[PDB]
Amino acid sequence: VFLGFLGAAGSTMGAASMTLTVQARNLLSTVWGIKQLQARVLAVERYLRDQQLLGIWGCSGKLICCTNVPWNSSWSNRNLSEIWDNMTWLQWDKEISNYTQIIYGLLEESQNQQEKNEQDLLALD
Amino acid sequence: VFLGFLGAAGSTMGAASMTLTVQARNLLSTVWGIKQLQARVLAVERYLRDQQLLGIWGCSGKLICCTNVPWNSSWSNRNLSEIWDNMTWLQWDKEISNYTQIIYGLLEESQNQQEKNEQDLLALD
Amino acid sequence: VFLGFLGAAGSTMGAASMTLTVQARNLLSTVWGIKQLQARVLAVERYLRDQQLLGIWGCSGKLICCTNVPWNSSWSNRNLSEIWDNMTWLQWDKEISNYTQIIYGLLEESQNQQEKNEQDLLALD
Amino acid sequence: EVQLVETGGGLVQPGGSLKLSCRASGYTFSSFAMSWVRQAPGKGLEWVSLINDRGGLTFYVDSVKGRFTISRDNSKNTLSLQMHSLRDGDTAVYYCATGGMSSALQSSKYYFDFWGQGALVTV
Amino acid sequence: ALTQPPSASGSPGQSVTISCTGTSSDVGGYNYVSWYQQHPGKAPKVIIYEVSKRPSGVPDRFSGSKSGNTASLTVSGLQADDEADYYCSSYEVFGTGTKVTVL
Amino acid sequence: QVQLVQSGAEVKKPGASVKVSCKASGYTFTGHYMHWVRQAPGQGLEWMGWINPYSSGTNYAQNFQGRVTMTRDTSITTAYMELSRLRSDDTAVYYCARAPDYGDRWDFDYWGQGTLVTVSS
Amino acid sequence: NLWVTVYYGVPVWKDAETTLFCASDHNVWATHACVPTDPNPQEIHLENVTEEFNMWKNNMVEQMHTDIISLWDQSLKPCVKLTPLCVTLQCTNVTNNITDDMRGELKNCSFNMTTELRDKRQKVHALFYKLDIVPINENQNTSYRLINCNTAAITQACPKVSFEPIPIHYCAPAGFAILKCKDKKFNGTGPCPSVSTVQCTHGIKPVVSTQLLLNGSLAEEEVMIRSKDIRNNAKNILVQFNTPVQINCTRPNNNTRKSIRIGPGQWFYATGDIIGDIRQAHCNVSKATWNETLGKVVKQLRKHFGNNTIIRFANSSGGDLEVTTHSFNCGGEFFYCDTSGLFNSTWISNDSITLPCRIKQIINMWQRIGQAMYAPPIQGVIRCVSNITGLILTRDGGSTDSTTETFRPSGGDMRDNWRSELYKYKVVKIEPLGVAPTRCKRR
Ligand SMILES: *[C@@H]1O[C@H](CO)[C@@H](O[C@@H]2O[C@H](CO)[C@@H](O[C@@H]3O[C@H](CO)[C@@H](O)[C@H](O[C@H]4O[C@H](CO)[C@@H](O)[C@H](O)[C@@H]4O)[C@@H]3O)[C@H](O)[C@H]2NC(C)=O)[C@H](O)[C@H]1NC(C)=O
Ligand SMILES: *[C@@H]1O[C@H](CO)[C@@H](O[C@@H]2O[C@H](CO)[C@@H](O)[C@H](O)[C@H]2NC(C)=O)[C@H](O)[C@H]1NC(C)=O
Ligand SMILES: *[C@@H]1O[C@H](CO)[C@@H](O)[C@H](O)[C@H]1NC(C)=O
Ligand SMILES: *[C@@H]1O[C@H](CO)[C@@H](O)[C@H](O)[C@H]1NC(C)=O
Ligand SMILES: *[C@@H]1O[C@H](CO)[C@@H](O)[C@H](O)[C@H]1NC(C)=O
Ligand SMILES: *[C@@H]1O[C@H](CO)[C@@H](O)[C@H](O)[C@H]1NC(C)=O
Ligand SMILES: *[C@@H]1O[C@H](CO)[C@@H](O)[C@H](O)[C@H]1NC(C)=O
Ligand SMILES: *[C@@H]1O[C@H](CO)[C@@H](O)[C@H](O)[C@H]1NC(C)=O
Ligand SMILES: *[C@@H]1O[C@H](CO)[C@@H](O)[C@H](O)[C@H]1NC(C)=O
Ligand SMILES: *[C@@H]1O[C@H](CO)[C@@H](O)[C@H](O)[C@H]1NC(C)=O
Ligand SMILES: *[C@@H]1O[C@H](CO)[C@@H](O)[C@H](O)[C@H]1NC(C)=O
Ligand SMILES: *[C@@H]1O[C@H](CO)[C@@H](O)[C@H](O)[C@H]1NC(C)=O
Ligand SMILES: *[C@@H]1O[C@H](CO)[C@@H](O)[C@H](O)[C@H]1NC(C)=O
Ligand SMILES: *[C@@H]1O[C@H](CO)[C@@H](O)[C@H](O)[C@H]1NC(C)=O
Ligand SMILES: *[C@@H]1O[C@H](CO)[C@@H](O)[C@H](O)[C@H]1NC(C)=O
Ligand SMILES: *[C@@H]1O[C@H](CO)[C@@H](O)[C@H](O)[C@H]1NC(C)=O
Ligand SMILES: *[C@@H]1O[C@H](CO)[C@@H](O)[C@H](O)[C@H]1NC(C)=O
Ligand SMILES: *[C@@H]1O[C@H](CO)[C@@H](O)[C@H](O)[C@H]1NC(C)=O
Ligand SMILES: *[C@@H]1O[C@H](CO)[C@@H](O)[C@H](O)[C@H]1NC(C)=O
Ligand SMILES: *[C@@H]1O[C@H](CO)[C@@H](O)[C@H](O)[C@H]1NC(C)=O
Ligand SMILES: *[C@@H]1O[C@H](CO)[C@@H](O)[C@H](O)[C@H]1NC(C)=O
Ligand SMILES: *[C@@H]1O[C@H](CO)[C@@H](O)[C@H](O)[C@H]1NC(C)=O
Ligand SMILES: *[C@@H]1O[C@H](CO)[C@@H](O)[C@H](O)[C@H]1NC(C)=O
Ligand SMILES: *[C@@H]1O[C@H](CO)[C@@H](O)[C@H](O)[C@H]1NC(C)=O
């Protein structure tokens, strides 16, 4: 499982988006019998929290998920070639750390809950 | 995350159904280093059990999920206006505690497994 | 919950595929207060790992999941009647233990990631 | 008490881009779905478009599906209809009405309960 | 403060009723009224607790109720092992005592 | 088996002190209030007081306040009641009784045998 | 017509009992293990919610009781054991100038103590209080023993561990919530129409005391009288004040700490001597403030016992020293103060008070078996200012006069003290999953 882990860390975002399963499979597994257990418990919570995010968004069970949130040029004005072909995910995460929680809120609030309510109302027509 | 938690506990079920993400995000996180760890483990199991229910039903990854189980007037004869507009979720849960496991069984047994088998058979046509 | 557990272990695979929820619901729950806690933690990890497999495949939230991996006669030349009507799951698992990781790799690599990328490209047409 | 009052109606040429606006009062605007229904001078009633209570789901007849755009503002209590590429067949009195659908949490409202004065449109 | 008749009497097969009367007002203080049976020579045993509950192992014959200030026991099915002293209690007050004579 | 075993009968003169013990067994001693109730021969039941065997706190009836002392020992699981300055009418059967729980209920589930104390000249 | 719709995230809860964890801003209550607190903790008001609360069945009190006892044992575990101190003591009366209040309370005891070398002994002398020393024999041999030597082993408290109570917060784990009753006239039990949800409780100082509640919470408007059953004299009455009464407790004696090496790395801390005169420890309360506070308490008790009933306060009728006196820990010293002048009054419906205090250095906290603690002396003079925020009273039963009610101090069960702070908090578990009819059908 470990093999290939973080190998595309220095690759472009496009090239590094085809190895998502390699990172995904590496997120899940005498006081030293307690502390290690705590670490195991910690890993589970982190995994579940990320999965919870994917579930409050319409992204449950997916590694690549398309959404209805428009991109804002304030978050980033770079082209697609300057993000996917000429840029790595670490650089992108360093720039967009500043805006992550606005995008997360837009993902959580407007799009998924309005879409879910609209499916609730279309299903009773 | 905590902010707004249980705020719609006294609101109507309709008004309180638009805040589901607020409760959903608050379900997941020296003998005192063990007992607290047990509590953390306990929370995970509860979360997973509820998610497991949603998965055995056709509701995985959703906060609002529509099903094929007809409502039975024996469970409740109240109108929709007397449930969603003039009633809270605590009152509803107190009345329908008596019938919860019948609805859960109907959700688990007839609808999801028959639908899943019917998709298994439609996919081979 | 326990009632009916593994009851179809000796039944045919077809008959034993209608009781999947019974096994699914039984996977989730002083040094003896630590060891038992470790066991609980262990169960969670196993559950999550299996769920993770189902998520890296296109099978999240499903107990029966159809895929795009063709069956290979090298894995098994038996008919459908000799698998579903005249055979149990333990016998099938004993034969196909030898081939499980090839099928798992084909499930993980070609079909789901190519399908996910193709949906990523169809959604922007 | 429910008072629907349409405006923006008048005369336009083929290819015109005409905007009508229906103002509502006397009831909770955001709690009801709204529709536009048209009546040609010499014919009966024809349903044109439907918008839900939240303004997120819109439905149209095939004959206007790519030309008309129903919209609503729930703070201002204003329903609106923007018609582009108006055709000779679109000459009619347009009425705004309350009803046509409801959310899953309400009773069925598959009918038009309240109606407007009407607004003449001559293409 | 919990007056009781001085004596009561019954015949084998029929039923007897003992009454306890409280001088004080109702003031919802009579929720916890217990009854005791003192076979001569021994220590009292509890027949009713909280007006109309029975300790496990007590026969259904003993059964009391309440009405405002008053509160009563009913020994229905009187035998010959009912020659005891019956006392009503409200917390610390004890009843005055009724000697139930079998006939 | 829950048991309460009291000391044997005693003969006292007026002006003396008498101390009656009650050994408890079969339950958690600190979890139930201990009550002392006396019954003179031929008369009804008279409640004397209670002791909290956990906190050691006591409560005496007004008839006995100033004369009666109640104590406990959790090491040997024993409750004690001492009456000073006995009088002629003080002759009675002194019972210890266990409350069904921690001071909420006054319907005494278990009683001791009863210690007969007679006071005479 | 209607179909089952599943909702996840439903704001519904059930009564629950769980293990609440800790938050706090060389301490008895650990504090390092306890999680650090978070600034500006969120409080959310639940509008249109009425929730039943029972203080008298609140598992937060039982958990706090267990946690404080366990923390005390954990603090005592690594400290020096004083088992060698069970030797014959030769005690005489102190020869300094001693006030009559203290004549015979403090004894000068000499004994043969061990040293770092197992083949040597030292002749040493320490000052001990009379409430910690027992005559070995009835005869006047002047040979005495420590009070605990026959029944329990004694451990010295670590001098570096402060006995000052610090506020602690009890926090619910994920999936659970703490509901706080915000009604300001809440009698303890029943529906609460004004409810909020909190991450954690307020800062609760686990102050250990009897008969008086110290450094607690005040009632918002009026004195509150809370009892599980006000007609049951076997249950305690918790009185919560709306204004604090300031109490000033001092140990006037200047004190020294003498260090005696009893083992290779074990030190025993003796009082040694007193510089200057010897005076009795005592507490002062304002007479007028206490008298108005008692007037308010009587005014509130008449709401339960009658407008025309006489309310009398009298001293404790019995029990051990911890419950017959106002016991408390301040400055590191344990005071047992005589409250017979606080509760000495009849109230018919129509300066300062000095409470003498005795000191013990050998303490058996709670009522554990076979474990006692020696309290090392504190150097200097201890001056302590505390707020009295409530009382624990017991009503005299078996009264032969129905026109008068008599109340006496009680205590000794610390669950009644910590229930005076946790009375407004309830723990519930969240039930986020629910079903309801809607018109939406699955395709
Ligand atoms: C109710 O609350 C009040 C106010 O918080 C509280 O009184 C306070 O008590 C503490 C601890 O006894 C006092 O702090 C001490 O003050 C003296 C003054 O000289 C210092 O010497 C002390 O420090 C020495 O001891 C410490 C260990 O205790 C060592 O860590 C330190 O190095 C020193 O050796 C210490 O600071 C505080 O001054 C009072 N406050 C007032 C206003 O009097 C009271 O105790 C609480 N009541 C109860 C019953 O708990
Ligand atoms: C306690 O007793 C000891 C002796 O057992 C006293 O110590 C002696 O005190 C006198 C005072 O004049 C000194 O001269 C001696 O040298 C001391 N002897 C030792 C062995 O130290 C001590 O002072 C007494 N303390 C009190 C407070 O009474
Ligand atoms: C590193 O960059 C070079 C170009 O400089 C590229 O050819 C190579 O594939 C990159 N490595 C990885 C692991 O993507
Ligand atoms: C983009 O962000 C800015 C603030 O940075 C905001 O004012 C603007 O409305 C946003 N644009 C869109 C289209 O959401
Ligand atoms: C977009 O592409 C052009 C191509 O010439 C490049 O020079 C430019 O830097 C890019 N712009 C941004 C904002 O990334
Ligand atoms: C966000 O702000 C930080 C400073 O607070 C800055 O380092 C970062 O680069 C900002 N974002 C962008 C896109 O520059
Ligand atoms: C509480 O009820 C009132 C009507 O009595 C309503 O206006 C208010 O919005 C409700 N509060 C919440 C939080 O829903
Ligand atoms: C509704 O419940 C009753 C029992 O309460 C049952 O007999 C009846 O068949 C149910 N109706 C439907 C339509 O499932
Ligand atoms: C349904 O609505 C009517 C409207 O008049 C109301 O009076 C009635 O109580 C409701 N019925 C039920 C069963 O809730
Ligand atoms: C279910 O039964 C319980 C008593 O067992 C009762 O309290 C509850 O209200 C019942 N359900 C309904 C809808 O009344
Ligand atoms: C076991 O096999 C027999 C036929 O030999 C069959 O009738 C029976 O149903 C099987 N048992 C189970 C549990 O499937
Ligand atoms: C089946 O497996 C064999 C090896 O066992 C492999 O060579 C062959 O290509 C596989 N066939 C298909 C259709 O994938
Ligand atoms: C397939 O079915 C036939 C039917 O006659 C059976 O005899 C044969 O064994 C089966 N073949 C395999 C490969 O399982
Ligand atoms: C796989 O190989 C093992 C021996 O390594 C053998 O026991 C097993 O039966 C093989 N698979 C099949 C289908 O025979
Ligand atoms: C010593 O003090 C005691 C008090 O414990 C007293 O009774 C005794 O008389 C004193 N003896 C003297 C001064 O000799
Ligand atoms: C200490 O021991 C000596 C003998 O070494 C003995 O005479 C003396 O009395 C002892 N002292 C005490 C205070 O017991
Ligand atoms: C609180 O009020 C309830 C009734 O709502 C009552 O049972 C209880 O005794 C009251 N407590 C006090 C101290 O008055
Ligand atoms: C206590 O005595 C010491 C002796 O050094 C002195 O420094 C200190 O000031 C005295 N303290 C008081 C409060 O008198
Ligand atoms: C207490 O009051 C008395 C009154 O005489 C006074 O002398 C003493 O100093 C006071 N004590 C304190 C600690 O304030
Ligand atoms: C207690 O001490 C304070 C100063 O710390 C003083 O103002 C107050 O009057 C004193 N109270 C009493 C009752 O002596
Ligand atoms: C205490 O207050 C009461 C008010 O009820 C008053 O009658 C009495 O004189 C006061 N006593 C003192 C000493 O202030
Ligand atoms: C209580 O006061 C009386 C005098 O009224 C006294 O004899 C008795 O010893 C005191 N009790 C306590 C515990 O202080
Ligand atoms: C109690 O009050 C009486 C007067 O009723 C007084 O003589 C006595 O000194 C007081 N006792 C105490 C201990 O303050
Ligand atoms: C006593 O109460 C007052 C008013 O509530 C407060 O300011 C003060 O800090 C409190 N004192 C202590 C020692 O807690």
Author numbering:
A (entry chain F), B (entry chain B), C (entry chain D): 518 to 546, 569 to 664
D (entry chain G), F (entry chain H): 1 to 52, 52A, 53 to 82, 82A, 82B, 82C, 83 to 100, 100A, ...
E (entry chain L): 3 to 9, 11 to 27, 27A, 27B, 27C, 28 to 91, 96 to 107
G (entry chain A): 33 to 57, 66 to 141, 150 to 186, 186A, 187 to 309, 312 to 321, 321A, 322 to 398, ...
Can you provide the manuscript's text about this entry?
In a double-blinded, placebo-controlled phase 1 human clinical trial, the recombinant, germline-targeting envelope glycoprotein (Env) trimer BG505 SOSIP.v4.1-GT1.1, adjuvanted with AS01B, induced bnAb precursors of the VRC01-class at a high frequency in the majority of vaccine recipients. These bnAb precursors, that target the CD4 receptor binding site, had undergone somatic hypermutation characteristic of the VRC01-class. The GT strategy for inducing VRC01-class bnAb precursors is rooted in the hypothesis that these antibodies target the CD4bs with a similar angle of approach to VRC01 and use the same conserved contact residues. To verify that VRC01-class mAbs elicited by GT1.1 do not just exhibit similar sequence features to VRC01-class bnAbs but also target the CD4bs in a similar manner and with the same atomic contacts, we selected five mAbs for further structural characterization.
Accordingly, based on the prototypic BG505 SOSIP trimer, we designed GT1.1 to engage bnAb precursors against the trimer apex and the CD4bs, specifically those of the VRC01-class. Finally, GT1.1-induced VRC01-class mAbs are structurally extremely similar to VRC01-class bnAbs. An important hallmark of VRC01-class bnAbs is their ability to accommodate the N276 glycan, which is achieved through specific SHM events as germline variants of VRC01-class bnAbs do not bind to Env with the N276 glycan. When inspecting the GT1.1-bound structures of the three mAbs that did not have measurable affinity for fully glycosylated BG505 SOSIP, we found that these mAbs would clash with the N276 glycan. We conclude that GT1.1 vaccination selects for CDRL1 characteristics that help accommodate the N276 glycan, without the need for the N276 glycan to be present in the vaccine.
